[PDB]
Amino acid sequence: VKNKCVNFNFNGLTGTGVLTKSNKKFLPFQQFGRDIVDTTDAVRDPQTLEILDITPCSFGGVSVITPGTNTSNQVAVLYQGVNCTEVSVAIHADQLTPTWRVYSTGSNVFQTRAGCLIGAEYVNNSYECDIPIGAGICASYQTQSQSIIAYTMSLGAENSVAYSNNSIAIPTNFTISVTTEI
Amino acid sequence: LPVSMTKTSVDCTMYICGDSTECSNLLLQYGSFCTQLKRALTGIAVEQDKNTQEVFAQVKQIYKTPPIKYFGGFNFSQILPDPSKPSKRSPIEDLLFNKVTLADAGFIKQYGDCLGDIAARDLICAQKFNGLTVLPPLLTDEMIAQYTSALLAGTITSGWTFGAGPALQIPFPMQMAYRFNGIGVTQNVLYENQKLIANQFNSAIGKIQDSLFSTPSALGKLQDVVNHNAQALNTLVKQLSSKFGAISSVLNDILSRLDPPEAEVQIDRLITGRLQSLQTYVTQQLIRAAEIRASANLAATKMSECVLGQSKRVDFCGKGYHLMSFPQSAPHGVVFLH
Amino acid sequence: SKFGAISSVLNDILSRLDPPEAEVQIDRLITGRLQSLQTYVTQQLIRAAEIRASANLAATKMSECVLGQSKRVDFCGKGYHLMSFPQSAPHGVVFLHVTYVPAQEKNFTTAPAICHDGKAHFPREGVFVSNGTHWFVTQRNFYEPQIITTDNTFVSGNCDVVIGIVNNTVYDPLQLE
Amino acid sequence: LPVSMTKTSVDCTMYICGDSTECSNLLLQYGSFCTQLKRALTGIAVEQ
Amino acid sequence: VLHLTQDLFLPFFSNVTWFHAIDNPVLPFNDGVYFASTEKSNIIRGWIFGTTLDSKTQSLLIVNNATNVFIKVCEFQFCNDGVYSSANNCTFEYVSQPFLMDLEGKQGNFKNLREFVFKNIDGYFKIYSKHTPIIGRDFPQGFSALEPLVDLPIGINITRFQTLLALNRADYYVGYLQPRTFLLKYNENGTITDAVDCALDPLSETKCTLKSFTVEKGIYQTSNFRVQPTESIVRFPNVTNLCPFHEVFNATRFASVYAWNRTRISNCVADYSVLYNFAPFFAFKCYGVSPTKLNDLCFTNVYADSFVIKGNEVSQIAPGQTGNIADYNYKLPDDFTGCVIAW
Numbered sequence A: 001v002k003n004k005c006v007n008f009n010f011n012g013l014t015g016t017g018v019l020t021k022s023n024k025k026f027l028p029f030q031q032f033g034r035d036i037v038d039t040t041d042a043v044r045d046p047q048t049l050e051i052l053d054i055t056p057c058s059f060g061g062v063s064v065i066t067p068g069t070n071t072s073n074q075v076a077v078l079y080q081g082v083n084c085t086e087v088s089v090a091i092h093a094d095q096l097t098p099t100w101r102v103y104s105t106g107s108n109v110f111q112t113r114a115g116c117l118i119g120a121e122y123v124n125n126s127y128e129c130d131i132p133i134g135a136g137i138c139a140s141y142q143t144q145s146q147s148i149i150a151y152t153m154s155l156g157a158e159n160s161v162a163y164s165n166n167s168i169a170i171p172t173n174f175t176i177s178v179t180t181e182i
Numbered sequence B: 001l002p003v004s005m006t007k008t009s010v011d012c013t014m015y016i017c018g019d020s021t022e023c024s025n026l027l028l029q030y031g032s033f034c035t036q037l038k039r040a041l042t043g044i045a046v047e048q049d050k051n052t053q054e055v056f057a058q059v060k061q062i063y064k065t066p067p068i069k070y071f072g073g074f075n076f077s078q079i080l081p082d083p084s085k086p087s088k089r090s091p092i093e094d095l096l097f098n099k100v101t102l103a104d105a106g107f108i109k110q111y112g113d114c115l116g117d118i119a120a121r122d123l124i125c126a127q128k129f130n131g132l133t134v135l136p137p138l139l140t141d142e143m144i145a146q147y148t149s150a151l152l153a154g155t156i157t158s159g160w161t162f163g164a165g166p167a168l169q170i171p172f173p174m175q176m177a178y179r180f181n182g183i184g185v186t187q188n189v190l191y192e193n194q195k196l197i198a199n200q201f202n203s204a205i206g207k208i209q210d211s212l213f214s215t216p217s218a219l220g221k222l223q224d225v226v227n228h229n230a231q232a233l234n235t236l237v238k239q240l241s242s243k244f245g246a247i248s249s250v251l252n253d254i255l256s257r258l259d260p261p262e263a264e265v266q267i268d269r270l271i272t273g274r275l276q277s278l279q280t281y282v283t284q285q286l287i288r289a290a291e292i293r294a295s296a297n298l299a300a301t302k303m304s305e306c307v308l309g310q311s312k313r314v315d316f317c318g319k320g321y322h323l324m325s326f327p328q329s330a331p332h333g334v335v336f337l338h
Numbered sequence C: 001s002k003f004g005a006i007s008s009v010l011n012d013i014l015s016r017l018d019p020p021e022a023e024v025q026i027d028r029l030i031t032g033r034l035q036s037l038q039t040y041v042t043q044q045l046i047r048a049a050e051i052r053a054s055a056n057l058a059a060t061k062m063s064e065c066v067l068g069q070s071k072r073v074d075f076c077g078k079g080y081h082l083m084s085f086p087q088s089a090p091h092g093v094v095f096l097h098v099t100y101v102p103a104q105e106k107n108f109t110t111a112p113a114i115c116h117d118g119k120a121h122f123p124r125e126g127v128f129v130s131n132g133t134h135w136f137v138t139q140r141n142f143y144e145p146q147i148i149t150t151d152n153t154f155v156s157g158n159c160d161v162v163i164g165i166v167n168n169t170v171y172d173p174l175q176l177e
Numbered sequence D: 001l002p003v004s005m006t007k008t009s010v011d012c013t014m015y016i017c018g019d020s021t022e023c024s025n026l027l028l029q030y031g032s033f034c035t036q037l038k039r040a041l042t043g044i045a046v047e048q
Numbered sequence E: 001v002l003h004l005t006q007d008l009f010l011p012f013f014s015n016v017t018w019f020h021a022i023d024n025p026v027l028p029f030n031d032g033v034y035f036a037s038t039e040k041s042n043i044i045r046g047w048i049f050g051t052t053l054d055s056k057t058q059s060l061l062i063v064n065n066a067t068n069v070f071i072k073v074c075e076f077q078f079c080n081d082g083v084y085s086s087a088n089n090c091t092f093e094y095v096s097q098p099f100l101m102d103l104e105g106k107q108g109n110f111k112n113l114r115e116f117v118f119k120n121i122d123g124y125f126k127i128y129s130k131h132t133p134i135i136g137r138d139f140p141q142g143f144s145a146l147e148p149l150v151d152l153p154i155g156i157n158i159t160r161f162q163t164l165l166a167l168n169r170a171d172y173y174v175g176y177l178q179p180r181t182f183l184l185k186y187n188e189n190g191t192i193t194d195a196v197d198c199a200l201d202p203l204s205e206t207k208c209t210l211k212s213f214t215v216e217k218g219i220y221q222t223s224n225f226r227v228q229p230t231e232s233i234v235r236f237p238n239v240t241n242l243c244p245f246h247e248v249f250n251a252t253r254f255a256s257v258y259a260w261n262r263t264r265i266s267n268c269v270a271d272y273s274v275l276y277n278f279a280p281f282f283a284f285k286c287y288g289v290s291p292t293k294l295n296d297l298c299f300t301n302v303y304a305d306s307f308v309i310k311g312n313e314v315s316q317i318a319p320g321q322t323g324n325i326a327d328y329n330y331k332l333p334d335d336f337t338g339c340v341i342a343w
């Protein structure tokens, strides 16, 4: 059963992960496989004499972004650093360790460089960052009638200077500002 | 000056007890000795994000250079963003990005090709195996170059006015006149030897590119930061290979071989070893984070003083009587052009 | 936290077991509590170093912006620093940076130098600024147009090498009297 | 103003196992634990 | 306080089966069963528990009456309706104040709602109750803690559940408990004003990991997600290397007991199905190892001593035995780690 998270007990080497075909160069006497950090990487099939690779199962980390509970109860779920199709099939097969299930409408799907975001919808507009998610993506609570929206952070107002060969601007007036700093 | 380093979110639970219910139960007896580590690591990530934000996002308005680039004979193509390049980076920025090699990029989503590694799996797949992941930074290497571009465009088309108030355009010639006046030489010499100073500046700009190209390692500070982080990560991963004084270094082997009440001592020994190793890693990461925070504060104040105006303190903005500085983005750091 | 021992309460565990076999659990409790304390003290040292750096920065900012005026830009608040008034805060300090910031600006004109008669005139301080018809001089950070006199300018040049030079006349109070 | 403090190169084997082969062997069971300390002290000396 | 605990609780917004009355299906009991019933005066009497509900395994009977209770750990025979017909192996008679108390303000609209929860962790039967004339429509929404009444260490086998009704001339609310981690808000008087799950909603999990009831705007790292593997493969080498057990069982001249042939077996995989299928045994007594557990142990060396003998001599041959064979022909060591086969 390849290309599936499966508990393996190969010749006494027991572990968890996904196994598939490989293009290793195992010598005939070779039985196990490893890497620089001494973690079992490849195993030879004792009854097939083929080479299989060992992978983490689905490792990631769930982070929840939310506004104040006194404001709203709606929440959004981040699955850190996982392709968002993999969580989709795992949810549909009901093999995810998290038992809480955030509903998937198809419009709340977001493949982000930081992972897959569920429960928020993409708006192609640009706003100032409110809740940092990562990879230049920020979410906030915004009315449509209210929901959680995800957008690329606006670096600021787009402004262009009036540089020229012989044109200058001199302030004819001035203001007094009292800032604060802690 | 380095600005930040990779953000990690080690999870002690299955870093120490790989999918072992009894090991998790044993770990539960050690109290909240894990929440401390998770909170410390997430705090370190937050401070690093804050460091890069302080050291770069200094101007609220993003500016762009005028389409024509003739600033009184001065040449800025080597530092201005390249429209032909799809990443919109300076030629020097390209050299900085190519002379730095990151073992762990972070924004890779490398799951799905570890099974397809064919050869021996690499460092990142190894980390993914045993409960260690890298959290990608908020400010992508892309728009940060946009920030540096905005800062550079502000400092050559408006002098230093835009750092105190509204951006007021000043042509580059009398801007240099004022930078000469701020050090103690009258603008007349610049207005006589404009051609000579322009040629000298162009020659220096051209030579610094060759200096960065031909040097063995001038970006050694950023490379050292990356190498130290990778080495700490590698030794943390390798520490799971130590029996720590028990029968074997494989928790699952110990579980499947001995009874619970006798393998209990061995798994407790493994917990005491692995958790303490994670403690050393976390403390060392804290020290490195404090050091890089101090360096990033220094970089922020250096940028605010030298780049956004003329600094009167000697040797602070490079050796000699300072005139101006030009910022350039680097992997996990910044590069200055005094 | 039991720390892998019989119980987490010392007075009970000594009152539940005799010494010669209880000392194992006592040692386990000792090492658990000692490791927790070591982690706490290390974190406290880290926090103390960070707060020491912050306090040194605060002291420097205090001695700069309050006991005088600092020319370091974006140090004593955004904009041109004027003063700063400290305020007491719980376990901290509060500054009130008073900063001069410009306002409404207008395009007028500029000239790097003005040539009256074969000689280039440069402003002693400020910009040679033209309304659009008449050339004038003023400061950098405020628009105070003034008549171009020989007191506002110093002459040194030959009126042939200044790129972008402009034509006009300069005034002097000595020829009239 | 202080500038530097006394550079140290503590040695794991000599410090914790005085010339004892079995002690060193059982130390080796702890993995590369103290190599980190040796690297840290070397880095401290270089920094100073 | 905002104490957190882990124990078998009824999940929030879980599924509760609602029944009626006017037969008495026996619902399974596993990891506890939640109960509730609202009534005017009374229609329910007691509960019976246990496995197969007959006079063979110890069971339970909790009938309540007008003044007291009748809890008893008994092994009653059958009633199929005077509710028991056997008290031979029955002990633990317990009587106390009735669980149900009814209060009515001169009108029956105050339907007394009674909430019961039972569990059998390491024996120690526990009963939970809080009685109030709640709104009375049905299973309500407002929070309500549960007051323990009796903690009794039964310590018997328990598998099925049933309840006993009353006579006459809307209830039955049944839920199940699962191991979950919860938060409980304690009032300054000590009451539980509100409680939160940690395995129901992402927001609830955040309130758990950041233990509180108010969460500020922001991002919080709560836990990790891992896909549990679906199937488990066990793979071992293609080696078969069948032992000579066939050759020691298919022989035709099994030696006499006086000259017992001792065969040395090495370098083979000891599959015991080959001995299982070859002989209809009559004595497969094992001493050092379990007869079921022979295929999961690796042995340094195996001796197969075969000799045909009489019938009673089969029982004679055993460790620490005596007899004309056990003393002069073959004597089994007292520390015999092995099995004998007689067919």
Ligand SMILES: *[C@@H]1O[C@H](CO)[C@@H](O[C@@H]2O[C@H](CO)[C@@H](O)[C@H](O)[C@@H]2O)[C@H](O)[C@H]1NC(C)=O
Pocket (backbone or CB within 6 Å): A172, A173, A174, A175, C103
């Ligand atoms: C510079 O800007 C000031 C405000 O920042 C102006 O002061 C204002 O004056 C008006 C009346 O003219 C008041 O109504 C207002 O409250 C404020 O005091 C000031 O006039 C202006 N001066 C110039 C020359 O632009």
Ligand SMILES: *[C@@H]1O[C@H](CO)[C@@H](O[C@@H]2O[C@H](CO)[C@@H](O)[C@H](O)[C@@H]2O)[C@H](O)[C@H]1NC(C)=O
Pocket (backbone or CB within 6 Å): B075, B076, B077, B078
């Ligand atoms: C500014 O400096 C540029 C250096 O990158 C000059 O580009 C050069 O272009 C020539 C061909 O046009 C190349 O052969 C050379 O390698 C370099 O890329 C650019 O001309 C220059 N412009 C001005 C106005 O000085």
Ligand SMILES: *[C@@H]1O[C@H](CO)[C@@H](O[C@@H]2O[C@H](CO)[C@@H](O)[C@H](O)[C@@H]2O)[C@H](O)[C@H]1NC(C)=O
Pocket (backbone or CB within 6 Å): C131, C132, C133, C134
């Ligand atoms: C050039 O600068 C002159 C300042 O002296 C402005 O001239 C003014 O014109 C008025 C009449 O319109 C006079 O009464 C006054 O004394 C002054 O000379 C003039 O507006 C300005 N030109 C432009 C285009 O800004």
Ligand SMILES: *[C@@H]1O[C@H](CO)[C@@H](O[C@@H]2O[C@H](CO)[C@@H](O)[C@H](O)[C@@H]2O)[C@H](O)[C@H]1NC(C)=O
Pocket (backbone or CB within 6 Å): C165, C166, C167
């Ligand atoms: C400023 O005015 C000068 C005369 O006062 C001009 O000088 C003249 O330049 C012309 C050629 O442009 C010569 O033919 C003539 O002999 C005299 O030298 C000067 O050009 C002028 N410059 C500008 C920028 O207006």
Ligand SMILES: *[C@@H]1O[C@H](CO)[C@@H](O[C@@H]2O[C@H](CO)[C@@H](O)[C@H](O)[C@@H]2O)[C@H](O)[C@H]1NC(C)=O
Pocket (backbone or CB within 6 Å): E187, E188, E189
């Ligand atoms: C805890 O219990 C106290 C003792 O009954 C309560 O105080 C009482 O409050 C009532 C009003 O509800 C007063 O009339 C009475 O005199 C006494 O002060 C207290 O409210 C209660 N706290 C709770 C339930 O939160």
Ligand SMILES: *[C@@H]1O[C@H](CO)[C@@H](O)[C@H](O)[C@H]1NC(C)=O
Pocket (backbone or CB within 6 Å): A046, A047, A048, A049, E238
């Ligand atoms: C394993 O044994 C079976 C049974 O004889 C045989 O069909 C198969 O080819 C063998 N495979 C290997 C790799 O030895």
Ligand SMILES: *[C@@H]1O[C@H](CO)[C@@H](O)[C@H](O)[C@H]1NC(C)=O
Pocket (backbone or CB within 6 Å): A083, A084, A085, A086, A111, B108, B109, B110, B112
């Ligand atoms: C991950 O990203 C997408 C979405 O799943 C798809 O191309 C594939 O699964 C992965 N691709 C890469 C390059 O990792």
Ligand SMILES: *[C@@H]1O[C@H](CO)[C@@H](O)[C@H](O)[C@H]1NC(C)=O
Pocket (backbone or CB within 6 Å): A122, A123, A124
């Ligand atoms: C609007 O958003 C969609 C995706 O949500 C994107 O493809 C499109 O380019 C956006 N439009 C603009 C004008 O940015």
Ligand SMILES: *[C@@H]1O[C@H](CO)[C@@H](O)[C@H](O)[C@H]1NC(C)=O
Pocket (backbone or CB within 6 Å): A163, A164, A165, A166, B068, B070
């Ligand atoms: C400035 O002058 C140069 C040369 O005199 C010319 O190439 C350029 O187009 C001019 N730009 C402006 C804005 O006047």
Ligand SMILES: *[C@@H]1O[C@H](CO)[C@@H](O)[C@H](O)[C@H]1NC(C)=O
Pocket (backbone or CB within 6 Å): A162, A169, C105, C106, C107
């Ligand atoms: C100067 O002129 C440019 C030309 O478009 C204009 O954009 C800018 O706003 C002007 N600045 C002023 C009037 O201060």
Ligand SMILES: *[C@@H]1O[C@H](CO)[C@@H](O)[C@H](O)[C@H]1NC(C)=O
Pocket (backbone or CB within 6 Å): E013, E014, E015
């Ligand atoms: C409870 O069960 C019913 C019917 O089986 C189903 O419709 C409902 O969705 C279930 N509720 C939950 C919370 O699972």
Ligand SMILES: *[C@@H]1O[C@H](CO)[C@@H](O)[C@H](O)[C@H]1NC(C)=O
Pocket (backbone or CB within 6 Å): E065, E066, E067, E068, E069, E070, E095
């Ligand atoms: C009710 O049960 C108790 C249990 O001891 C018993 O004593 C009593 O006789 C029963 N009947 C009444 C009417 O109380």
Ligand SMILES: *[C@@H]1O[C@H](CO)[C@@H](O)[C@H](O)[C@H]1NC(C)=O
Pocket (backbone or CB within 6 Å): E055, E056, E075, E086, E088, E089
């Ligand atoms: C009670 O147990 C005894 C054995 O101790 C048994 O003989 C008897 O049949 C049991 N009573 C029943 C099953 O009613």
Ligand SMILES: *[C@@H]1O[C@H](CO)[C@@H](O)[C@H](O)[C@H]1NC(C)=O
Pocket (backbone or CB within 6 Å): E246, E249, E250, E278, E279
């Ligand atoms: C002996 O071997 C034959 C051939 O496999 C088999 O049919 C028979 O049942 C065996 N008899 C015994 C006693 O093992």
Ligand SMILES: *[C@@H]1O[C@H](CO)[C@@H](O)[C@H](O)[C@H]1NC(C)=O
Pocket (backbone or CB within 6 Å): E247, E248, E251, E252, E253, E254, E255, E261, E262, E263
């Ligand atoms: C053991 O020896 C006896 C001697 O008579 C023989 O009959 C029997 O077949 C032997 N069993 C073996 C070789 O397995």
